[PDB]
Design a protein around this motif. Sequence first.
Motif, PDB file in Angstrom:
ATOM      1  N   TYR C 317      23.541  39.302  36.826  1.00 57.42           N
ATOM      2  CA  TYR C 317      24.577  38.286  36.848  1.00 57.42           C
ATOM      3  C   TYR C 317      25.834  38.842  36.190  1.00 57.42           C
ATOM      4  O   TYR C 317      25.783  39.360  35.070  1.00 57.42           O
ATOM      5  N   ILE C 318      26.956  38.764  36.902  1.00 58.18           N
ATOM      6  CA  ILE C 318      28.241  39.086  36.290  1.00 58.18           C
ATOM      7  C   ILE C 318      28.755  37.904  35.483  1.00 58.18           C
ATOM      8  O   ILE C 318      29.142  38.047  34.321  1.00 58.18           O
ATOM      9  N   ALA C 319      28.745  36.718  36.086  1.00 64.49           N
ATOM     10  CA  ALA C 319      29.178  35.491  35.437  1.00 64.49           C
ATOM     11  C   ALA C 319      28.440  34.330  36.083  1.00 64.49           C
ATOM     12  O   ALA C 319      27.995  34.415  37.231  1.00 64.49           O
ATOM     13  N   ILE C 320      28.314  33.238  35.336  1.00 68.49           N
ATOM     14  CA  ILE C 320      27.705  32.016  35.843  1.00 68.49           C
ATOM     15  C   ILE C 320      28.605  30.838  35.511  1.00 68.49           C
ATOM     16  O   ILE C 320      29.074  30.708  34.375  1.00 68.49           O
ATOM     17  N   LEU C 321      28.866  29.995  36.505  1.00 71.75           N
ATOM     18  CA  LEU C 321      29.517  28.710  36.289  1.00 71.75           C
ATOM     19  C   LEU C 321      28.549  27.614  36.704  1.00 71.75           C
ATOM     20  O   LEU C 321      28.107  27.573  37.856  1.00 71.75           O
ATOM     21  N   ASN C 322      28.222  26.730  35.770  1.00 71.02           N
ATOM     22  CA  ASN C 322      27.407  25.562  36.058  1.00 71.02           C
ATOM     23  C   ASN C 322      28.305  24.337  36.141  1.00 71.02           C
ATOM     24  O   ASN C 322      28.945  23.963  35.153  1.00 71.02           O
ATOM     25  N   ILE C 323      28.352  23.717  37.315  1.00 65.33           N
ATOM     26  CA  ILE C 323      29.009  22.427  37.480  1.00 65.33           C
ATOM     27  C   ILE C 323      27.943  21.352  37.316  1.00 65.33           C
ATOM     28  O   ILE C 323      27.086  21.180  38.181  1.00 65.33           O
ATOM     29  N   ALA C 379      26.951  31.257  40.543  1.00 66.10           N
ATOM     30  CA  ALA C 379      26.548  32.501  39.912  1.00 66.10           C
ATOM     31  C   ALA C 379      27.020  33.662  40.768  1.00 66.10           C
ATOM     32  O   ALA C 379      26.997  33.586  42.001  1.00 66.10           O
ATOM     33  N   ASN C 380      27.440  34.735  40.111  1.00 64.54           N
ATOM     34  CA  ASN C 380      27.677  36.015  40.766  1.00 64.54           C
ATOM     35  C   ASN C 380      26.511  36.939  40.447  1.00 64.54           C
ATOM     36  O   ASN C 380      26.353  37.377  39.303  1.00 64.54           O
ATOM     37  N   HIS C 381      25.701  37.243  41.455  1.00 71.32           N
ATOM     38  CA  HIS C 381      24.525  38.079  41.276  1.00 71.32           C
ATOM     39  C   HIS C 381      24.570  39.181  42.319  1.00 71.32           C
ATOM     40  O   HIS C 381      24.774  38.907  43.506  1.00 71.32           O
ATOM     41  N   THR C 382      24.383  40.422  41.872  1.00 72.44           N
ATOM     42  CA  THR C 382      24.534  41.566  42.759  1.00 72.44           C
ATOM     43  C   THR C 382      23.516  41.561  43.891  1.00 72.44           C
ATOM     44  O   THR C 382      23.741  42.214  44.917  1.00 72.44           O
ATOM     45  N   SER C 383      22.403  40.844  43.727  1.00 71.20           N
ATOM     46  CA  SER C 383      21.394  40.747  44.771  1.00 71.20           C
ATOM     47  C   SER C 383      21.888  40.018  46.012  1.00 71.20           C
ATOM     48  O   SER C 383      21.220  40.086  47.049  1.00 71.20           O
ATOM     49  N   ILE C 384      23.021  39.317  45.938  1.00 65.99           N
ATOM     50  CA  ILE C 384      23.565  38.703  47.144  1.00 65.99           C
ATOM     51  C   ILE C 384      23.967  39.770  48.148  1.00 65.99           C
ATOM     52  O   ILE C 384      23.970  39.525  49.360  1.00 65.99           O
TER      53      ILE C 384
END
Lengths: 375, 61, 452, 133
Positions: C317-323, C379-384
């Motif tokens: 994960y580079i960054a996570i935003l939870n709304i 979430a920004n995850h490199t697995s995408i």
Amino acid sequence: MDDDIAALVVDNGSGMCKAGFAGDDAPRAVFPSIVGRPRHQGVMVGMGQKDSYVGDEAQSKRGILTLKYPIEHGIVTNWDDMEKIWHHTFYNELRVAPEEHPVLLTEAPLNPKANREKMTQIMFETFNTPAMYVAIQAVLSLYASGRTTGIVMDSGDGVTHTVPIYEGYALPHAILRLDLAGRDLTDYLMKILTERGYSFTTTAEREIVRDIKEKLCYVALDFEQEMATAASSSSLEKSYELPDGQVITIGNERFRCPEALFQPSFLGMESCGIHETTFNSIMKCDVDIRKDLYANTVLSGGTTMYPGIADRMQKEITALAPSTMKIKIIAPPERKYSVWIGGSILASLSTFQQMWISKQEYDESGPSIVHRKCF
Amino acid sequence: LECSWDELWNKVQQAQDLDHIIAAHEVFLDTIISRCLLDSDSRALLNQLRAVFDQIIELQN
Amino acid sequence: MPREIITLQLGQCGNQIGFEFWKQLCAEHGISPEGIVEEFATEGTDRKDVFFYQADDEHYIPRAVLLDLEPRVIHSILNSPYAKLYNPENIYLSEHGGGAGNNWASGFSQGEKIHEDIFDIIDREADGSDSLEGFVLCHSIAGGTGSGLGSYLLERLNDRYPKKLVQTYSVFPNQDEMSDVVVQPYNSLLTLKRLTQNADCVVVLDNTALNRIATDRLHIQNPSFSQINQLVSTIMSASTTTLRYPGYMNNDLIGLIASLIPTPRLHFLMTGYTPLTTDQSVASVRKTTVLDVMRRLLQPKNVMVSTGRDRQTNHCYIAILNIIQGEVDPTQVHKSLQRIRERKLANFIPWGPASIQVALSRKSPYLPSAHRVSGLMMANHTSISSLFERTCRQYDKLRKREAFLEQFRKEDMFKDNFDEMDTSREIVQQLIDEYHAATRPDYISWGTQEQE
Amino acid sequence: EEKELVAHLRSIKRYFLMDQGDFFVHFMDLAEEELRKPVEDITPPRLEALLELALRMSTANTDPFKDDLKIDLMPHDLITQLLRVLAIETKQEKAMAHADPTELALSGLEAFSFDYIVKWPLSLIINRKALTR
């Protein structure tokens, strides 16, 4: 100054509840028997809005509240909401501790015994009153008329009752109820105003039409003659200027609306006219007391405030009663508040102080005391 | 913001008198100022934050 | 003034999703099936002008454009109760009704042929928008209309509206099901190529993940497009709540996504939804805590994005935003962030400071919410990249067999070559490499031509 | 009623007497790795956050008095605290009370204790001597 803890006087009119202190000439609080709860719980919750407002507080919050009436057509329909309304009245308007004051309650004619019991339970358990009594509103108005024998015509907004009373005792076999009152006449007036070209469709516009009815409608002494006059002369026609400056014209509706009291079909009501209801009540009374009932006809309630109702009632009762029957219609000028005045009068008697049901008697007999203790 | 607002709202809903309301509003303002790094103790922190904002504006430009 | 958003629904799946989205938005805003605000909808606190236009002083019309190359879906939309909600000038239906035949190249050629008419319709809808921010395309990448017509429309919007953002909701083919459209991987590759060159953000919707979720969570053996569209409409409603429930922060989409897309190449977004509940469990508004929310969000069953298992790239994960939507205590949010850090519940980018952002949101007042707390995870995850790599592998698998390629060669976009598929493979490779780099401190030089 | 004596006793059992064994098992299973670090390397805020997260994640979250449970970091390891407790009933209490906190960088497991905030007048019952014992 002896701060005699005043008994509470609560006049539950079909349209408006009126409440106050014993020995007052009028109830101190008079508000519509309406409880409003916020229509949108969400936005105003943060602004300290109550979950519900009652009476005048419901009206003040009408924009954001959904209003409910715990008394429907003169009948209590929400006992919890009625108790909440009474609590709001006591603590906010009257600002009194009901545990510290005897409470005189009023009841509608023919109130169900179980409803009286539930009211008694609520009064004794919720308000912890030291003593209470439940009186029929029309009976209190009769006491306000200084009579012990007679028929009381109590007419609020939601329901009409005819209550014969003899020697201080109501005559239950001769009591008649009419589910026709100020609300039906208000709806008829709104209809005739829409027919006149004034559009009243909102509950706010409905209340405007109600105020128009209260201000400009009157009872014809002869409904047909007044209708003929209004058709032949604009003297019965009235113009009304709306708050926006629009002028509406009202003619025979000034007297056609209250003409429904003699001809309820004029309002589209299937109920008997006031003359027919009076005749049926007299026939339901003892022949020996019928003379005195005609002689002791008391007008009560806000729906008795119509101008001209007394002359029409006199004419009709004279045409309907035996010529030998002494008929006397008593139309107190305060008959809109007659219930509250009578409650103040009744509760002021020294001999009445023993008639209150005490908290001890409630705890001893339970809610059934209303059927067992208040006779 | 959220904490100072919730504290203000709770105190106001619980306020019994005008002096209590005044005190609650003063406390709210002081708490916000401290949390906004605007108090005297954060003055060095406030200056460092101002320098950070200036470097951020320089970076933006 | 609100930043109006035009919603583009493309092809069968995209148009169904758009229709269900408009239904959900109307329900959340208290708009009648005719587009009129209901009398009970007295809370004028919502910003309709971001997503809706006013048709009259009372009638709110969705800023939604339903676009298909086949008339069947548009006619089916026009037969719904919500036909009167939308402005009819924002409805473009292909006169030929033939669709793209599940051919991306055919869809692109049809979009090019209807470019003038489509842009005239778009301008007519745009005049109803006070401060139109841009267009959002809802489409499938495997079909012809949503993939091809969507790519053509995206190209023409990028050319005509070069200063407006273009986000896409691109429905990717089910990767666990064998597609009967042997050229579906080629169509998807051409669409991904165009998304790489002409789209700014592609929301990947894997039909395989939708079917899997319907089967395991909704107990739907064969998830219909309609059930997927209703789930998508719920997701879109949650994503638009901050537009529909205005507050101090996150009042616009660009403000929300700015933190998520550091470079133009890192434009692959992942989604998350919370709380995930079966329809039957609406009864109990569970007091989910921020810690409980974060714990449920970390379950792959609750993430609205099917990223492939990349074995080669140490995805992070580079960054996570939870709304988060519903009743949220800020002190509970702070304690939750503290616990997440102590528990290392979130991995941050290695090349810069990064954290889990938390947004608290109100629910729609017009729509009764069965849940006290709801949440979106971004979430920004490199697995995408592995999802994109998997799409590329499927494209290569079809191209190497030339399966169903003759149908694409009939259309000009694919008539001479499959270069769009090869460009898609190269873009997905660069995405994989950048995603692996983004787990590393050398991400500072990620996306530099020397690093490419 | 006001001092919730029975509730306080149940809370003490749950935390000080480890009555909530599933809660304690979960907390120790989660926190053993972090607590294994030397005290000098332990970040007290990190230990506190992990404690609160286990508390909400363990069955201690089901305790209505769980919010009265606080984390206390003993200045000495569990062995030195134990020696103090062992001396409490012995004439060595003064010697263990004057025993310097163990210079050994106590593991979080050895430094872990609960604290309980008792307000006056309820602080009259859960006194500092009883709480310390």
